[PDB]
Design a protein around this ligand. Structure first.
Ligand SMILES: *[C@@H]1O[C@H](CO)[C@@H](O)[C@H](O)[C@H]1NC(C)=O
Ligand SMILES: *[C@@H]1O[C@H](CO)[C@@H](O)[C@H](O)[C@H]1NC(C)=O
Ligand SMILES: *[C@@H]1O[C@H](CO)[C@@H](O)[C@H](O)[C@H]1NC(C)=O
Ligand SMILES: *[C@@H]1O[C@H](CO)[C@@H](O)[C@H](O)[C@H]1NC(C)=O
Ligand SMILES: *[C@@H]1O[C@H](CO)[C@@H](O)[C@H](O)[C@H]1NC(C)=O
Lengths: 395, 395, 395, 395, 395
């Protein structure tokens, strides 16, 4: 007619159309929603409140049996857009979410032909996830998102995947690669959910694989922790007996405590787990404290009237395996002989006070061995963490 | 007829239906809402603002006497879903809440048959609770949630439990066990509420039992506080008199103050209570300060012209119970005898300055006893706190 | 008739009813709103942004002359509930508020009989108040809430109190007593408000009296500040002259600075006032600094060639009131006499360097007096603050 | 008639009334909005994000030519209130704003007579402003608010002031004077805005004058910075040469660094400017560092084998202007003479090591002069800042 | 007619007008939206969450074929404003955004003539961007904003630029120049977007060029880092051998660590990059630590019984290139000769302990060379960063 095609097509469709009833002619046939997920960016991974922020491009389609027309009647048009609030829209929600509402709504949907309705929308999802930092510098996380209908059972709503699973697994078309986390794989999975003997529901789980970039954390933390070899080589060659070691070890302890003072403002906080690097740091702290204490005992003993046991019961264990594994003229001469002792009184002080450096080292040597074993353990665990991080790129 | 069943059933029901009036044919019969609560996760327990964040799956049903139909008239269908905003929905609210609004709405409800209407919805509840941290590492909390109608009295609205109470007590089907707090029991309870002589209301209280996981806090706090035995064994065997103790005790005091500097960033803050562990920490601080002061007095006395009272009035109390519980030739000889005194002047300095180590220990020994009693008290209170924590799993 | 009573009663009332016009038959009679306030909890008192968060149960009623019916016509029912958005609701707002919107709405109101309409609603009020912390540990606050209509004058809207004032003064039926602040009195007051010569408005002020619980702040702050007697008794009996005091006072200054380092994370921050306890703390700091400086001068003078003025002009003021208020044989003997002076050269060093401890104390004694006066002032002001806090419970 | 007056008056007005068209009979006449601004409180001045929070009581009126009636027809009533959402309301917005939405809406407006419509509403405005802290303790700020229509040009909407400008300049009727900032003047101003050659817009700028209260900041910051005279008088009279100054200056440097450690938690942060007081503080820090360094050189030189140049090229400049601006008997006697040198070897050590205190002071005296000039500059700039602050109350 | 023109024109237009259909008579012609962007202010650049906050004045127009009229029929009016919610409005969104919703809506649009509809609105955009701080003090950022339709393809919606590109490039008419960042260029760009073989979309990218103001950061950070020349000139001229250097270098290390303690509260935090200035700071820290260690070895060696290798294998490399690139009378005489050795025993101690200052400097000199090279590198990199910053103003 003279009326333009789109206006009278919308009049023919939307008038005498009841939004709020499931668009099926036979109620025994469930409606099928085919959803798709495209990854855009990873905005934040809190790893203290166990929640991550993500931004996802989302689309889905279903069949609306009451929106059908013959094209050549309405001037041969095969697609139009009508407002979302005037048709039936299913309720698809995420099971795990903390706060949603910063994602806007799109008030337009295509109704292509034969009832094909398509919805395009962005998503600002803040979803709870179980984030572990056991291997902090080299983390690989394994988070899930579940799509389902909160009310409709599987006899009313089915969920299917839009594309083939392989395309969804490797889809990095619009991802931002200038952040901190690197996307690896989005793995879809279908499940039937039921926690009671009456009703069952359809779910579509998406597993998101992310991986940290360790360069920043390596150059900012590991090399100052490589300085344990510096402290070892400055504490080894320096005389272990009374000298400047006590003071210089104290200064290095203050420095290595200032380092962990700075580090605590950068390492993540979590109330259920701690990084293994922190375990190695506190082990190094304990060994430094025991080293300082042992140096204090050795300094004190050989300079404050050493009365150590010559042959105590511990000597047997000391020697069993440690040495294997690791008129007035007469009065004038009398007083001259009496005052001649000043030379001895000036000389016999060092010989008194320089006794037992030999026995003091039996503990410094063992503690040096402990330092080297600790450093070797740190190196091997760092290498194996890097290996586990690097082998995760196969998926 | 030719019209499909669901559309004309919705037309028959919703047309000439007035939302806003209580759906009863006789106004003397109150409507009964049967509610249920399923526990999902404990997102946050603030324990500083006395509020916890929780996520609960919720459902309820009531009877709508104006939504009834004979199935075989409408093509034998016995269930349909209609929008929530087109029927009467009761107002069930939580008495204690700080901020709600991050939980979305579900715009669909089943109207099964004979007026059975079911509502399914998630809940993001941020509810105030009285959280105590007296036994911080081993806490067991006891929080409540109250469901009632804010306007309708008990003559208009009754609240009943959906399932049997035993099922609600032990329902951990969908709980997340990868967090910090562990769920123990959800105990329902019915009460009739009235704060005036005219109106009474129906409530349904739910008591949520949670329990902290102490592993993280134990390995991160207790063992550095186990190092009090390290400080005791390094302060005992080291000479108590003038030597290196003053300085070494000062260094340990700086270290044990750095520890509580770090701890204050991890211990919770509350303006109405403090953990008992903090009480033991400050007691240890006070004892360390008194030890350092006593060492300073002992160092000062025996090296700066000791003029202590030989037999003061305190000697009686010192000995009563402490020792039980715990031509020119003549001038030449004259000047030789005069200058012979240099040996004595060089020798009689140590004997002057090494007087009274015996009396100085009467206080170091007692203070060592005080340290051991404090450590024993710490150990026994830690054991009893763990026992109280472990016996709470029976419920 | 056959139609049930509630439905046709709602039809008779709400149909041909215009929401948006004040429900009076004669426009010269103002409508009267009778409000009531019940106290539930005090969620937060910020005392840095001068705002407090409160939770109040609220109710009010007015007369709607267009909602009237004869009961026995409509099957003898004398109460019903109708949606709030379908009738006229007055605009009652708080004058002082920072952010509202976290309190939900109740979409139901009773219309009892003869036009009696009742509204029940919770309130999440975040209202600005003038909070002072002059007596921080023992605060008693005096905050107001004002209820009025923002547009309607007193010729259109009147505000009256629901119950008698005495009941509102003492109403602690549902208060939570497990928080930090204690409720004392809610005092209603009526006022007529007008800031221009044309229009006047009706207000209903509510004064909320709250009171801090000082136990936590006392046990956490006062006793370490009771340790000023510890520092006084360790600085008094220790020799004031050159010895270990300079160093030990330095150590106590570092400790008493670490204390205020910790305290600054717990004391409240306010840009218009400071607690008097902080004034006493900084006075103690200044006195400690002046003590350390005076000890440095006394140490320096009596050990570095004292050339003080014997009788300067200050001696008169020093003594006026301070002492009241507070062949070759000849050469051989010659060289022997020359070398005999070594005894004097070894002995006359202490006598040179031990001059004037007597004059040094004239300042240490006065400064000790200053410490005791400062401690007495601290004690008396703490006692009077506690007395003012305790006498406030009469109201 | 029998129908009450207000209901049929509202029926006569609102029926057949089209909201959404500008209420003028002739479209060539712009509508005039007469606005007013009343100041209530200044909630926050961020001075780090360059934004302030304000609370303003607001009102405006315009003429609605379609809402007119003869009073004696409708029972002689000359005012009524009708809902805001049923009439035409202009769009008046602030040009500069960061976040609005915490101010509620008032759903009622008076339509007095002959089309006089009045709107009363509160405002929660968070507006960006250029805040400078050059004179932090004594700031006077100069912030603007602009009211205009975002779409309608001046041919459609005009903005006029309700009252006379003088009344708006001095209007402190409802201001809260218990905060931090003091209101001085609200200066209205009219401008015609146009950034293109086609369209012009009408604006009404309001300049808000505020002023800080300096008491808190003075008593909390200036007096500890008055202690520079304390450090000057303790560093002047103390011997400048080797003694206790190096150590005592180090202790004062640690104290004066602890002071600025505390201050950094209270001084405001701004990325475009710094207070001049901070400049004086860092100048004092630099002068203290140079003083400590110069003392170290002087201590080192006169005690470690001084080999300074006697007459270098700098001596000319040193003296030009600085001094103006500022058998066996023979062997027995031989060995006696040889050993007689012990007296000289014991005596000639001080005379060697006490050389050149005279030359060392040439730098300490000059640096003392620098300290006094710095203190004088600090005092004069503080006085002039106070004078500028005090003279701002004339407006 | 008697009815005023605007009311009946609005009646003629809006009645029988269907909002929700694209306003084209022929559906094969896409609608064209001509957009414009005007820059107002840069509120925040987070550079830790990789997001910036911006405020933009925005406008656009399109053609509405169903809103057309002949002017002289409706009393010769050629423009009117009608509510936005009563006509068709396209959906133009930004691809990258984190949170929107603090920008209000303007419920009025001009419909000029022949279907010309204009929309004016402000925008509060919080958009994600890739912010780098490699050259922190002198940053130039390069951020994008993309405008497109989220649903409509290019066959339905086209996007064109309102003005010429040159005007948009240089448009600083209403910019605020009192902030931290300086606007340089807004560069528009058109692109056709398609990530699939079926649908294509039209985009309009806007590149926003901003530039930091370095004055504040220069005066607050660079000059204290210019004090490395102060530390170099106080560590060079001071004797490198045993003396006061160890202690004075320790004090400078504590000062230069306090500086970076203060700096960490002002430097930005980013998990993907670090400023080069921080790299130079940590290099200076490492060199200071190695200097202190080398001084400790040199102090220890020449004072604790030096037993260094005289001619080790390292001597060849030491000398190859380093020196090029950089009765009783007999007994009386016997005892006199025996006691005559006291002079030698008092004299031969310094000569023993003053051995090898010559060899110790071979490392201090090299380390001084390292300091000068580090300072030169710092200066040249600062100059080149300033040059890159200054040359960016050409665009
Ligand atoms: C629609 O298709 C028919 C048959 O294929 C064709 O004749 C007609 O031209 C098409 N519509 C238009 C508007 O061209
Ligand atoms: C409904 O039930 C009747 C009787 O049980 C049965 O005959 C009929 O087939 C059922 N409806 C349908 C659609 O099959
Ligand atoms: C209402 O009151 C009348 C008279 O008191 C009484 O007869 C009647 O039974 C009452 N209504 C009902 C439903 O009982
Ligand atoms: C309105 O004014 C008229 C004339 O002044 C007066 O007679 C009449 O009484 C007034 N209306 C009422 C309701 O009194
Ligand atoms: C509109 O234009 C016509 C012809 O140009 C003119 O005669 C008429 O006066 C104009 N309208 C009005 C209201 O003046």
């Amino acid at each position: 007619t003279t009326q333009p095609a789109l206006l009278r097509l919308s009049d023919h469709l939307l008038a005498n159309y009841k939004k709020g009833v499931r668009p099926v002619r036979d109620w025994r046939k469930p409606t099928t929603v085919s959803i798709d997920v495209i990854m855009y960016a990873i905005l934040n991974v809190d790893e203290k409140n166990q929640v991550l922020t993500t931004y996802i491009w989302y689309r889905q389609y279903w069949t609306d049996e009451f929106l059908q027309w013959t094209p050549e009647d309405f001037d041969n048009v095969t697609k139009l857009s009508i407002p979302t609030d005037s048709i039936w829209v299913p309720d698809i929600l995420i099971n795990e979410f903390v706060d949603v509402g910063k994602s806007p709504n799109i008030p337009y949907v295509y109704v292509h032909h034969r009832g094909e309705v398509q919805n395009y929308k962005p998503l600002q999802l803040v979803t709870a996830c179980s984030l572990d930092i056991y291997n902090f510098p080299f983390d690989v996380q394994n988070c899930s998102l579940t799509f389902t209908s909160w009310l409709h059972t599987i006899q009313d709503i089915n969920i299917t995947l839009w594309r083939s699973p392989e395309e969804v697994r490797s889809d990095k078309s619009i991802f931002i690669n200038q952040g901190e986390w690197e996307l690896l794989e989005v793995f879809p999975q279908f499940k039937e959910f039921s926690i009671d003997i009456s009703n069952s529901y359809a779910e579509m789980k998406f597993y998101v694989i992310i991986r940290r970039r360790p360069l920043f954390y390596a150059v900012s933390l590991l090399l100052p922790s490589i300085f344990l070899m510096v402290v070892d080589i400055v504490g080894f060659c320096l005389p272990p007996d009374s000298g400047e070691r006590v003071s210089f070890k104290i200064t290095l302890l203050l420095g290595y405590s200032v380092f962990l003072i700075i580090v605590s403002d950068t390492l993540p906080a979590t109330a259920i787990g701690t990084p293994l690097i922190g375990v190695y740091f506190v082990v190094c702290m304990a060994l430094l404290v025991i080293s300082l204490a042992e140096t204090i005992f050795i300094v004190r003993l050989v300079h404050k009237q050493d009365l150590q046991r010559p042959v105590p019961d511990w000597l047997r264990h000391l020697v069993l395996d440690r040495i294997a594994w690791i008129l007035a003229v007469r009065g004038l001469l009398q007083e001259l002989s009496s005052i001649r002792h000043f030379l001895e009184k000036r000389d016999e002080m060092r010989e008194v006070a320089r006794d037992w450096l030999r026995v003091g080292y039996v503990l410094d040597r063992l503690l040096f061995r402990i330092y080297l074993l600790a450093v070797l353990a740190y190196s091997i665990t760092l290498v194996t963490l890097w290996s586990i991080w690097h082998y995760s790129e196969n998926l």
